[PDB]
From a paper:
Here we address these limitations by introducing an artificial metathase—an artificial metalloenzyme designed for ring-closing metathesis—for whole-cell biocatalysis. Our approach integrates a tailored metal cofactor into a hyper-stable, de novo-designed protein. By combining computational design with genetic optimization, a binding affinity (KD ≤ 0.2 μM) between the protein scaffold and cofactor is achieved through supramolecular anchoring. From the catalyst perspective, we sought to address this challenge by designing a derivative of the Hoveyda–Grubbs catalyst (hereafter Ru1) that contains a polar motif, aimed at interacting via H-bonds with the protein, as well as improving the cofactor solubility in aqueous media.
To further improve the affinity and ensure near quantitative binding at low micromolar concentrations of dnTRP_18, we set out to increase the hydrophobicity around the Ru1 binding site. For this purpose, positions F43 and F116 were individually mutated to tryptophan. Both dnTRP_18_F43W and dnTRP_18_F116W (hereafter dnTRP_R0) displayed a nearly tenfold higher affinity with KD = 0.26 ± 0.05 and 0.16 ± 0.04 μM at pH 4.2, respectively. A comparison of apo and Ru1·dnTRP_R0-ΔHis X-ray structures with computational models reveals an overall agreement with the toroidal shape but notable deviations with regards to the shape of the inner cavity, as well as the position the Ru1 cofactor. The Cα root mean square deviation values between the AF2 predicted models and the X-ray structures range from 1.59 to 1.63 Å.
Author numbering: 23 to 233
């Protein structure tokens, strides 16, 4: 039950790490096996360690200690570490900022941590990122989460958000994928230095390899 999403996430992590898909597969599967987590979560851990600038062992150690410290899930600890690595701050500072933003926007801590990460990814203030994202939310009728993903995809593509949404909706129409999946395909192709068709072709080959 290896999904196209899972294959696309692997391709993305191969690009982030600057290694082959074969190497990223192996590295992700070793870590999934070692920790008994999902493939998606193993890919997320590889991404967090890249962002932290630590080894994977070290990132896992930090995440497990932070789970116990705050009583949160592994996923939440990883998101806190990620938001802190993107901010260049301590986890305590990251969570402090998330809590202030949580109260301001009336969103969850997890949503606030994602916003902080996204603003850092865009090189903008949070206020700017939230303004842009909320414009999209209202204009397109997408979630705040979806709007943030659109901002990030557009940046990877080197285009406006209008361009990114135009392409994503074409992929939805043509291939019957969700907007989320269309955005992921777009992002992966940009990260790999390929066309959308070639990214999807690769993903399918990889999905099968792991069948």
């Amino acid at each position: 039950g290896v999904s196209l999403e899972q294959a696309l996430l692997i391709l993305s992590v191969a690009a982030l790490l600057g290694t082959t898909v074969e190497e990223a597969v192996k590295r992700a599967l070793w870590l999934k096996t070692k920790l008994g987590v999902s493939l998606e979560q193993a890919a997320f851990i590889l991404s967090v360690a890249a962002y932290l600038g630590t080894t994977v062992e070290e990132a896992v150690k930090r995440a497990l200690k932070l789970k116990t410290k705050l009583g949160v899930s592994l996923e939440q600890a990883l998101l806190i570490l990620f938001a802190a690595a993107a901010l260049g701050t301590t986890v305590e500072e990251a969570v402090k900022r998330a809590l202030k933003l949580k109260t301001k926007l009336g969103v969850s801590l997890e949503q606030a941590l994602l916003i902080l990460w996204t603003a850092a990814e865009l090189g903008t203030t949070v206020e700017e990122a939230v303004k842009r994202a909320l414009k999209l939310k209202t204009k397109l009728g997408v979630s705040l989460e979806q709007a943030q993903a659109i901002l990030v995809v557009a940046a990877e593509l080197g285009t406006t958000v209008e361009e990114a949404v135009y392409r994503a909706l074409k992929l939805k129409t043509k291939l019957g994928v969700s907007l989320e999946q269309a955005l992921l395909i777009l992002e992966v192709a940009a990260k790999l230095g390929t066309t959308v068709e070639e990214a999807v072709k690769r993903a399918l080959k990889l999905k099968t390899k792991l069948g």
